């Protein structure tokens, strides 16, 4: 599981 990026 990864950290949510600043854009979709």
């Amino acid at each position, epitope marked *: 599981s990864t950290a949510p990026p*600043a854009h979709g």
Partner: antibody
Amino acid sequence: EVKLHQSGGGLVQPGGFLKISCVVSGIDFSRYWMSWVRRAPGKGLEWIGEITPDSNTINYVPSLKDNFGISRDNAKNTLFLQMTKVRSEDTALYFCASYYEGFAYWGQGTLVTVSA
Amino acid sequence: QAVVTQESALTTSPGETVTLTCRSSTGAVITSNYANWVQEKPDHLFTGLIGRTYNRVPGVPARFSGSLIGDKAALTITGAQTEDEAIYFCALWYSNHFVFGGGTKLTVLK
């Protein structure tokens, strides 16, 4: 305690090259998208690019893709920025950042001065 | 080559509400521009506030909120504090890169 520790930079001649590093501790570096931005007087903040955890997406602002290169080594928790053919207008403070919903963690900055 | 435009400067007073806006040269700001807001305090102390228009960065106080207002993205600060005197940059996403606006100098009258 999360630390984005930058090193490198300094003085470069016009047309020269430099590689900057950002070593990440306190978070699981292999989970994070990473980004490079630069700050210069009168030039606000400029986003240079970003890189996914697996390096298979590397995005750049189009004007900078020719002479900037972003890479990472997850085994050494390190993000890199390479610059080639630099010009005086590339003088700036360069910052690494990691994404968590937004620009969540920030390095301390690396000064690159381009002057002959 | 898109240009992102912000107010040059805004003045508010402690405890008041201030809204900063972010405009795109391409048309109305939409959710696929994933508006981000970053605060620059002195000594180049950067703090991410908002990503993807609405989402607070973990640990950011509730008095910072993101929205769309008309054709623009917006950052609202409620109960403004003198510590909030800073430069605020917005960034918009254009398919495969971010572009930062020119920043807004926020005064919270000391």
